[PDB]
Design a protein around this motif. Structure first.
Motif, PDB file in Angstrom:
ATOM      1  N   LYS A 119       0.825  -1.202   0.000  1.00 49.58           N
ATOM      2  CA  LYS A 119       0.000   0.000   0.000  1.00 49.58           C
ATOM      3  C   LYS A 119       0.862   1.256   0.000  1.00 49.58           C
ATOM      4  CE  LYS A 119      -3.008   2.387   3.317  1.00 49.58           C
ATOM      5  NZ  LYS A 119      -1.874   3.241   3.758  1.00 49.58           N
ATOM      6  N   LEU A 120       1.917   1.269   0.822  1.00 45.17           N
ATOM      7  CA  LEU A 120       2.832   2.407   0.869  1.00 45.17           C
ATOM      8  C   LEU A 120       3.467   2.649  -0.491  1.00 45.17           C
ATOM      9  CD1 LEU A 120       5.734   2.711   3.541  1.00 45.17           C
ATOM     10  CD2 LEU A 120       5.916   3.605   1.259  1.00 45.17           C
ATOM     11  N   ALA A 121       3.946   1.579  -1.125  1.00 42.18           N
ATOM     12  CA  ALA A 121       4.631   1.713  -2.406  1.00 42.18           C
ATOM     13  C   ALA A 121       3.732   2.376  -3.434  1.00 42.18           C
ATOM     14  CB  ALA A 121       5.095   0.340  -2.897  1.00 42.18           C
ATOM     15  N   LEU A 122       2.452   1.995  -3.452  1.00 44.65           N
ATOM     16  CA  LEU A 122       1.523   2.587  -4.400  1.00 44.65           C
ATOM     17  C   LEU A 122       1.216   4.041  -4.053  1.00 44.65           C
ATOM     18  CD1 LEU A 122      -0.137   2.378  -6.837  1.00 44.65           C
ATOM     19  CD2 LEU A 122      -2.038   1.456  -5.476  1.00 44.65           C
ATOM     20  N   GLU A 123       1.016   4.353  -2.765  1.00 44.13           N
ATOM     21  CA  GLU A 123       0.759   5.744  -2.385  1.00 44.13           C
ATOM     22  C   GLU A 123       1.907   6.648  -2.828  1.00 44.13           C
ATOM     23  OE1 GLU A 123      -1.189   8.019   1.040  1.00 44.13           O
ATOM     24  OE2 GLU A 123       0.573   7.201   2.058  1.00 44.13           O
ATOM     25  N   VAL A 124       3.145   6.169  -2.701  1.00 43.21           N
ATOM     26  CA  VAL A 124       4.298   6.960  -3.128  1.00 43.21           C
ATOM     27  C   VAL A 124       4.281   7.159  -4.638  1.00 43.21           C
ATOM     28  CG1 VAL A 124       6.828   7.017  -3.259  1.00 43.21           C
ATOM     29  CG2 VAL A 124       5.685   6.313  -1.158  1.00 43.21           C
ATOM     30  N   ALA A 125       4.016   6.087  -5.389  1.00 44.07           N
ATOM     31  CA  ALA A 125       4.005   6.204  -6.843  1.00 44.07           C
ATOM     32  C   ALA A 125       2.937   7.185  -7.310  1.00 44.07           C
ATOM     33  CB  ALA A 125       3.795   4.826  -7.480  1.00 44.07           C
ATOM     34  N   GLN A 126       1.785   7.137  -6.680  1.00 47.27           N
ATOM     35  CA  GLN A 126       0.738   8.044  -7.066  1.00 47.27           C
ATOM     36  C   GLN A 126       1.059   9.505  -6.774  1.00 47.27           C
ATOM     37  OE1 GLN A 126      -2.547   8.788  -4.704  1.00 47.27           O
ATOM     38  NE2 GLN A 126      -2.189  10.762  -5.707  1.00 47.27           N
ATOM     39  N   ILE A 127       1.657   9.771  -5.638  1.00 46.00           N
ATOM     40  CA  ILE A 127       1.970  11.154  -5.287  1.00 46.00           C
ATOM     41  C   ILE A 127       3.159  11.661  -6.103  1.00 46.00           C
ATOM     42  CG2 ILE A 127       2.970  12.531  -3.428  1.00 46.00           C
ATOM     43  CD1 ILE A 127       0.892  10.834  -1.632  1.00 46.00           C
ATOM     44  N   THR A 128       4.120  10.786  -6.409  1.00 40.55           N
ATOM     45  CA  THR A 128       5.202  11.157  -7.322  1.00 40.55           C
ATOM     46  C   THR A 128       4.658  11.542  -8.692  1.00 40.55           C
ATOM     47  OG1 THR A 128       6.708   9.648  -6.174  1.00 40.55           O
ATOM     48  CG2 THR A 128       7.344  10.422  -8.383  1.00 40.55           C
ATOM     49  N   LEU A 129       3.754  10.727  -9.238  1.00 33.91           N
ATOM     50  CA  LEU A 129       3.172  11.058 -10.533  1.00 33.91           C
ATOM     51  C   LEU A 129       2.432  12.389 -10.475  1.00 33.91           C
ATOM     52  CD1 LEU A 129       2.511  10.007 -13.526  1.00 33.91           C
ATOM     53  CD2 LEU A 129       0.499   8.929 -12.502  1.00 33.91           C
ATOM     54  N   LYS A 130       1.701  12.640  -9.385  1.00 33.54           N
ATOM     55  CA  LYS A 130       0.911  13.864  -9.299  1.00 33.54           C
ATOM     56  C   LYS A 130       1.794  15.096  -9.106  1.00 33.54           C
ATOM     57  CE  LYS A 130      -2.128  15.766  -5.887  1.00 33.54           C
ATOM     58  NZ  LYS A 130      -1.245  15.430  -4.729  1.00 33.54           N
ATOM     59  N   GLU A 131       2.818  14.994  -8.268  1.00 32.02           N
ATOM     60  CA  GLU A 131       3.567  16.165  -7.829  1.00 32.02           C
ATOM     61  C   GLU A 131       4.841  16.422  -8.612  1.00 32.02           C
ATOM     62  OE1 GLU A 131       4.366  15.954  -3.674  1.00 32.02           O
ATOM     63  OE2 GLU A 131       2.259  16.151  -3.069  1.00 32.02           O
ATOM     64  N   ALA A 132       5.466  15.384  -9.159  1.00 34.41           N
ATOM     65  CA  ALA A 132       6.805  15.523  -9.703  1.00 34.41           C
ATOM     66  C   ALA A 132       6.920  15.191 -11.183  1.00 34.41           C
ATOM     67  CB  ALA A 132       7.789  14.633  -8.928  1.00 34.41           C
ATOM     68  N   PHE A 133       5.920  14.552 -11.775  1.00 34.55           N
ATOM     69  CA  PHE A 133       5.953  14.248 -13.197  1.00 34.55           C
ATOM     70  C   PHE A 133       5.341  15.412 -13.969  1.00 34.55           C
ATOM     71  CE2 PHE A 133       4.216  12.256 -17.071  1.00 34.55           C
ATOM     72  CZ  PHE A 133       5.423  11.818 -17.612  1.00 34.55           C
ATOM     73  N   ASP A 134       6.118  16.011 -14.874  1.00 29.69           N
ATOM     74  CA  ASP A 134       5.684  17.231 -15.549  1.00 29.69           C
ATOM     75  C   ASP A 134       5.071  16.970 -16.921  1.00 29.69           C
ATOM     76  OD1 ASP A 134       7.838  16.842 -17.372  1.00 29.69           O
ATOM     77  OD2 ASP A 134       9.122  18.288 -16.351  1.00 29.69           O
ATOM     78  N   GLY A 135       4.743  15.720 -17.227  1.00 26.19           N
ATOM     79  CA  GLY A 135       4.266  15.345 -18.535  1.00 26.19           C
ATOM     80  C   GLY A 135       5.344  14.804 -19.447  1.00 26.19           C
ATOM     81  N   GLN A 136       6.603  15.149 -19.181  1.00 29.97           N
ATOM     82  CA  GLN A 136       7.766  14.662 -19.910  1.00 29.97           C
ATOM     83  C   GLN A 136       8.641  13.764 -19.055  1.00 29.97           C
ATOM     84  OE1 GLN A 136       9.965  17.158 -23.142  1.00 29.97           O
ATOM     85  NE2 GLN A 136       9.589  18.549 -21.421  1.00 29.97           N
ATOM     86  N   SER A 137       8.921  14.200 -17.837  1.00 31.72           N
ATOM     87  CA  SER A 137       9.957  13.599 -17.013  1.00 31.72           C
ATOM     88  C   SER A 137       9.707  14.010 -15.577  1.00 31.72           C
ATOM     89  CB  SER A 137      11.347  14.017 -17.500  1.00 31.72           C
ATOM     90  OG  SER A 137      11.452  15.424 -17.560  1.00 31.72           O
ATOM     91  N   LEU A 138      10.566  13.528 -14.685  1.00 33.03           N
ATOM     92  CA  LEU A 138      10.449  13.816 -13.264  1.00 33.03           C
ATOM     93  C   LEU A 138      11.391  14.947 -12.879  1.00 33.03           C
ATOM     94  CD1 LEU A 138       8.535  11.915 -11.428  1.00 33.03           C
ATOM     95  CD2 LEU A 138      10.705  11.601 -10.130  1.00 33.03           C
ATOM     96  N   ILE A 139      10.910  15.856 -12.038  1.00 33.45           N
ATOM     97  CA  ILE A 139      11.789  16.871 -11.474  1.00 33.45           C
ATOM     98  C   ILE A 139      12.610  16.224 -10.370  1.00 33.45           C
ATOM     99  CG2 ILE A 139      10.234  18.738 -12.093  1.00 33.45           C
ATOM    100  CD1 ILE A 139       9.253  18.776  -9.232  1.00 33.45           C
ATOM    101  N   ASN A 140      13.524  16.991  -9.776  1.00 33.14           N
ATOM    102  CA  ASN A 140      14.557  16.437  -8.911  1.00 33.14           C
ATOM    103  C   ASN A 140      14.181  16.470  -7.430  1.00 33.14           C
ATOM    104  OD1 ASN A 140      17.051  15.544  -7.895  1.00 33.14           O
ATOM    105  ND2 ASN A 140      17.889  17.627  -7.900  1.00 33.14           N
ATOM    106  N   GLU A 141      13.975  17.652  -6.876  1.00 33.73           N
ATOM    107  CA  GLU A 141      13.762  17.743  -5.440  1.00 33.73           C
ATOM    108  C   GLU A 141      13.052  19.043  -5.110  1.00 33.73           C
ATOM    109  OE1 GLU A 141      17.647  17.504  -3.733  1.00 33.73           O
ATOM    110  OE2 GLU A 141      18.189  19.566  -4.254  1.00 33.73           O
ATOM    111  N   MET A 142      12.554  19.107  -3.879  1.00 31.85           N
ATOM    112  CA  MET A 142      12.069  20.346  -3.285  1.00 31.85           C
ATOM    113  C   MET A 142      12.663  20.450  -1.891  1.00 31.85           C
ATOM    114  SD  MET A 142       8.209  21.727  -2.846  1.00 31.85           S
ATOM    115  CE  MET A 142       7.825  20.280  -1.862  1.00 31.85           C
ATOM    116  N   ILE A 143      13.380  21.542  -1.640  1.00 33.33           N
ATOM    117  CA  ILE A 143      14.011  21.819  -0.357  1.00 33.33           C
ATOM    118  C   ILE A 143      13.262  23.000   0.230  1.00 33.33           C
ATOM    119  CG2 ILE A 143      16.183  22.124   0.854  1.00 33.33           C
ATOM    120  CD1 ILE A 143      16.039  19.669  -0.957  1.00 33.33           C
ATOM    121  N   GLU A 144      12.556  22.749   1.332  1.00 31.37           N
ATOM    122  CA  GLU A 144      11.559  23.672   1.854  1.00 31.37           C
ATOM    123  C   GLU A 144      10.573  24.040   0.752  1.00 31.37           C
ATOM    124  OE1 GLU A 144      14.124  25.313   5.583  1.00 31.37           O
ATOM    125  OE2 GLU A 144      14.681  25.616   3.477  1.00 31.37           O
TER     126      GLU A 144
END
Ligand SMILES: OC[C@H]1O[C@@H](O)[C@@H](O)[C@@H](O)[C@@H]1O
Ligand SMILES: OC[C@H]1O[C@@H](O)[C@@H](O)[C@@H](O)[C@@H]1O
Ligand SMILES: OC[C@H]1O[C@@H](O)[C@@H](O)[C@@H](O)[C@@H]1O
Length: 391
Positions: free
Chosen positions: A275-300
């Motif tokens: 369940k954890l693994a899927l929740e992470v994948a879903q939030i990564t897709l929503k927050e970090a996937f820009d339609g092309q690729s994944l962004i790197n990080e957010m610090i604060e």
């Protein structure tokens, strides 16, 4: 499966065989052993560069896994070369375990013992044992595991840095304000990774218990419940030093946890981890996937939209894994689009090259090495190998 998925696998296999494998074969150091330590952005090898243990173990893992999956005898020979250098120069005959770094000739440069290094040693040695049957590799892998469990483990994780003789010391990893991080997600992630490989090949009860233990640590201490994000750099009690999200660590951890879960004998924990693994994948897709690729990080509140080679590699595997678990096409589409991004912007177009370290937010190449103590065949090689194995 599908026509798209089949063509995806074939494209990745061809890329591995025609680009990645021949490039790393060209880094073989036949004068002193091992593999050259550095190649700059202009594709010039510094043959005299210091040799990092993590890089050598990653190369050992890579060539061993290429043999195990592709049955390439040349890859087996390249793995043997990395193994010889590990056993001859990185392995500490007096106090056991793996040095941090040696010179291009193999003279010890940094003899401290870091769990991060020992974990990659287990990962590479266990893969090489599968490839070769060499019981010396097996013995060293088991000995590394025993040392981690009997000398380095504490109640809330591993103390990460030790002197050569295994006396503990403060860690060497720092936050971006210079505070020592006594617990790091990436040290503990690669312990999890290596213990999964070790258990897969050995199936010993001691190894199983330690694998369950580190999986539980991720669920209970490292994951930030309700956020889809893992803590990155922490104090000795898993309190974050900074509010930092590493989207690459998140999506890598997603599929590595899902992989470890397939071995769990505790059904409750197994369901929690899946369940954890899927929740992470879903939030990564929503927050970090820009339609092309994944962004790197957010610090604060500051977002780094650079495209880093290993981040994009782990995104391909993590989204493909999420597709396999859910059959939701959005993950498959994101995985293939990220690969198409890698092909267009990170695969070096120059001859005798491999992958670029990164492009910036505007997709411009940045002067960074092609080979360095932290740039390896492991993230991008494993991306290809995982898809080949899974399809
Ligand atoms: O192909 C290698 C060459 O590629 C170019 O982009 C430059 O960076 C050169 O300095 C380098 O030698
Ligand atoms: O640790 C090994 C290194 O030690 C340094 O002080 C120099 O002597 C280097 O030439 C050598 O490679
Ligand atoms: O500096 C450590 C970094 O090394 C790179 O090769 C990657 O493995 C990253 O996950 C890691 O953060």
């Amino acid at each position: 499966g599908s026509m798209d998925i089949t063509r995806f696998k074939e494209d990745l296999k061809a890329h591995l065989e025609e680009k990645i494998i021949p490039f790393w074969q060209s880094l073989k150091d036949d004068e002193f052993g091992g593999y050259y330590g550095y190649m700059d952005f202009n594709l010039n090898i510094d043959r005299k560069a210091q040799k990092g243990c993590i890089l050598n173990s990653r190369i050992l893992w890579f060539f061993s896994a290429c043999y195990n999956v592709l049955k390439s005898e040349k890859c087996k020979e390249m793995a043997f070369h990395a193994f010889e250098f590990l056993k001859n120069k990185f392995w500490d005959k007096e106090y056991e375990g793996l040095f941090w770094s040696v010179s291009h000739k193999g003279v010890p440069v940094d003899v401290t013992k870091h769990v991060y290094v020992q974990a990659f040693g287990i990962y590479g040695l266990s893969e090489y044992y599968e490839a070769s049957g060499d019981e010396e590799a097996l013995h060293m892998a088991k000995r590394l595991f025993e040392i981690l469990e009997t000398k380095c483990k504490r109640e809330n994780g591993y103390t990460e840095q030790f002197e050569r003789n295994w006396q503990e010391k403060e860690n060497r990893f720092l936050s971006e304000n210079g505070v020592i991080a006594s617990k790091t997600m990436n040290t503990h992630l690669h312990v999890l990774e290596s213990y999964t490989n070790l258990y897969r090949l050995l199936k010993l009860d001691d190894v199983y218990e330690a694998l369950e233990w580190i999986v539980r640590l991720f669920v209970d201490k490292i994951y930030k419940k309700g956020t889809g994000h893992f803590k990155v750099f922490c104090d000795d009690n898993w309190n974050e030093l900074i509010k930092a999200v590493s989207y690459g660590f998140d999506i890598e951890a997603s599929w590595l946890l899902d992989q470890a879960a397939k071995y769990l004998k505790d059904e409750k924990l197994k369901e929690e981890v899946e369940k954890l693994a899927l929740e992470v994948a879903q939030i990564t897709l929503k927050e970090a996937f820009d339609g092309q690729s994944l962004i790197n990080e957010m610090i604060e509140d500051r977002i780094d939209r650079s495209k880093i080679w290993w981040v994009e590699a782990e995104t391909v595997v993590g989204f493909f894994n999420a597709y396999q678990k859910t059959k939701e096409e959005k993950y498959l589409d994101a995985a293939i689009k990220t690969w198409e991004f890698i092909k267009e912007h990170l695969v070096d177009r120059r001859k005798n090259s491999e992958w670029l370290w990164k492009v910036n937010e505007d997709l411009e190449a940045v002067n960074m090495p092609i080979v360095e103590q932290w740039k390896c065949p492991y993230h991008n090689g494993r991306m290809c190998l995982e898809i080949i194995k899974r399809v």
